[PDB]
Amino acid sequence: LSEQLKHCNGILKELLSKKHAAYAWPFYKPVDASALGLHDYHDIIKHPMDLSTVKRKMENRDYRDAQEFAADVRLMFSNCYKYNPPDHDVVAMARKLQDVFEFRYAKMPD
Ligand SMILES: CNC(=O)c1cc(C(=O)N[C@H]2CC[C@H](O)CC2)n([C@@H](C)c2ccccc2)n1
Numbered sequence: 754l755s756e757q758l759k760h761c762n763g764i765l766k767e768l769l770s771k772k773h774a775a776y777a778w779p780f781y782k783p784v785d786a787s788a789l790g791l792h793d794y795h796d797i798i799k800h801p802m803d804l805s806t807v808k809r810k811m812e813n814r815d816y817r818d819a820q821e822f823a824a825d826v827r828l829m830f831s832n833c834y835k836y837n838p839p840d841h842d843v844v845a846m847a848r849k850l851q852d853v854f855e856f857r858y859a860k861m862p863d
Contacts (some may be wrong), residue, residue, distance in 0.1 A: 756862050757819040762811055764857050768804055768826075773853055776846035780804050780829055797836050802829040819861055826854055 783803045786794035807825050816822045833847040
């Protein structure tokens with residue numbers, strides 16, 4: 754449980770690392786709908802999520818288990834797939850970062 758949350762923290766550090774920055778950068782901070790002119794974003798996305806919020810929740814010991822952590826990371830990707838045209842670069846970037854996430858999450862010590 755501690756060990757599983759350390760694995761989750763390792764994944765989070767990797768998703769925020771320079772290695773993945775080319776496709777991870779749209780997920781670093783909350784979507785600023787107003788700044789991007791996406792005035793329908795908060796009508797379509799009821800539960801915004803981003804890696805800075807995941808990092809705050811990890812630092813605050815909000816996550817009680819790996820499943821709660823994974824739920825937030827996957828919510829972040831789901832929001833991207835729900836809102837954006839499926840042929841837009843941001844969806845390709847989501848797919849690439851979710852591939853990194855899912856393959857390493859699958860190696861959870863258990
Ligand atoms: C998690 N972030 C997102 O969901 C998101 C959505 C967007 C965005 O601007 N989406 C538009 C693109 C034009 C289209 O006609 C409507 C939707 N962006 C910006 C930062 C973006 C990311 C990647 C490359 C260009 C622009 N991040």
